[PDB]
Design a protein around this nucleic acid. Structure first.
Ligand SMILES: [Ca+2]
Ligand SMILES: [Ca+2]
Ligand SMILES: [Ca+2]
Ligand SMILES: [Ca+2]
Lengths: 203, 202
DNA sequence: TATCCGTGCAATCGTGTATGT
DNA sequence: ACATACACGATTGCACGGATA
């Protein structure tokens, strides 16, 4: 008991959200996904939004802690370390079951409408995490002459997450039709090479 | 006579875009069209039947405008293909119906196995781009525009992901950036990598 | 008379809160 | 904490019934 039911209720909620979406997922389906009733759900959570928010926020913090861990230990500069940060992320996209469903639901299994304020609150918070990490490593790379001096970083930060979102979207939408273990390193390498070399990324 | 059926169908497109797909009752579609559920049930079996006919007519029109500016443009396969993408991203800002078609397909629907209509449309839109990209890539090396050892398997995944990435980011940002200026840049970069990057070879 | 569209009603489903250990 | 019971709204599907041409 105690946190045991809370933990099992969260993952049963995450499992049901990934398989049958969020709109068609009743709170009773969440309850009997675990071994409890809605009386145990309403004690631990206010309503459906309060559960989705509590579930998806703790996951969103894990991904930025998994990033902060996998990135802080400076093993070879920062621009080359940022390379290892993105690939450990895509590696966790396949191994980490919780991190995998978090993105699959945010991209395919929920609707981004103002009426469901919980998902855009997570969508805006997911974007706010990446954009801050991207702008941080862009300056410390120019301050280290790893990239150019006149780098259009406003275009570059849009350029970075745009291509990484499309790989995430393409992999999920294709039903994992291709190998993310061999494609993501290729896509990341081509991306960072354009930041280093392509002229239309500057002013 | 037939003026109320067309009013109902494009009232569904607007309501799908504002409130999502699931959070819209058949009553809201009818009242947004100036009718009630009697005219909606007379023409369409249910909401999935209404979402099917609406998004199958738009998807086919997209296929022609994506194929019109192909036979319109005279020139080499690899250069008339860049203009095919630039005119496509322009229709995201010029064609309101086309803008809502992608925006609903990307942000305001659940791609889950129970939604048998969204997945059927999502793969129809994929096979359209899959066939067009594979057909331009095969004619590209028969013209010496791209290298002969080009990884054709990785290339269309690289092409489609970069394309969908700009579309998702533009929508998910709330149209936060100029699509008329960022699309030409990232399309030129995507094609410069097909011609010169070594990791796209075998 | 067939097609078009509004109206009334049964019936299911999800939620919220009170009730009882 | 957690299960159970009740009260209520929100949609859905087909009953129709009236209208038109
Ligand atoms: Ca369900
Ligand atoms: Ca609604
Ligand atoms: Ca070239
Ligand atoms: Ca009447």
């Amino acid at each position: 008991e105690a946190l045991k039911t809370k933990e099992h209720l969260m993952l049963a909620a995450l499992e049901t959200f990934y398989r049958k979406g969020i709109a068609r997922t009743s709170l009773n389906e969440i309850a009997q996904a675990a071994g409890v009733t809605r009386g145990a759900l309403y004690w631990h959570f206010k309503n459906k939004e309060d559960l989705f928010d509590a579930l998806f926020q703790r996951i969103c913090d894990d991904i930025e802690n998994c990033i902060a861990q996998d990135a802080a230990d400076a093993e070879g500069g920062s621009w080359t370390v940022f390379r290892h940060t993105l690939l450990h992320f895509f590696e966790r996209l396949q191994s980490n079951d919780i991190h995998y469903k978090f993105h699959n639901i945010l991209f395919l299994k929920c609707e981004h409408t103002e009426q469901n304020a919980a998902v855009i609150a997570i969508a805006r918070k997911h974007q706010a995490i990446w954009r801050e990490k991207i702008t941080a490593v862009l300056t410390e790379a120019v301050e280290n002459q790893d990239l150019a001096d006149d780098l259009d970083k406003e275009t570059a930060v849009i350029f970075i997450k745009s291509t990484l979102d499309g790989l995430i979207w393409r992999w999920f939408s294709s039903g994992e039709s291709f190998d993310l273990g061999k494609t993501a390193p290729r896509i990341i390498g081509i991306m960072m090479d354009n930041l280093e070399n392509h002229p239309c990324l500057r002013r």
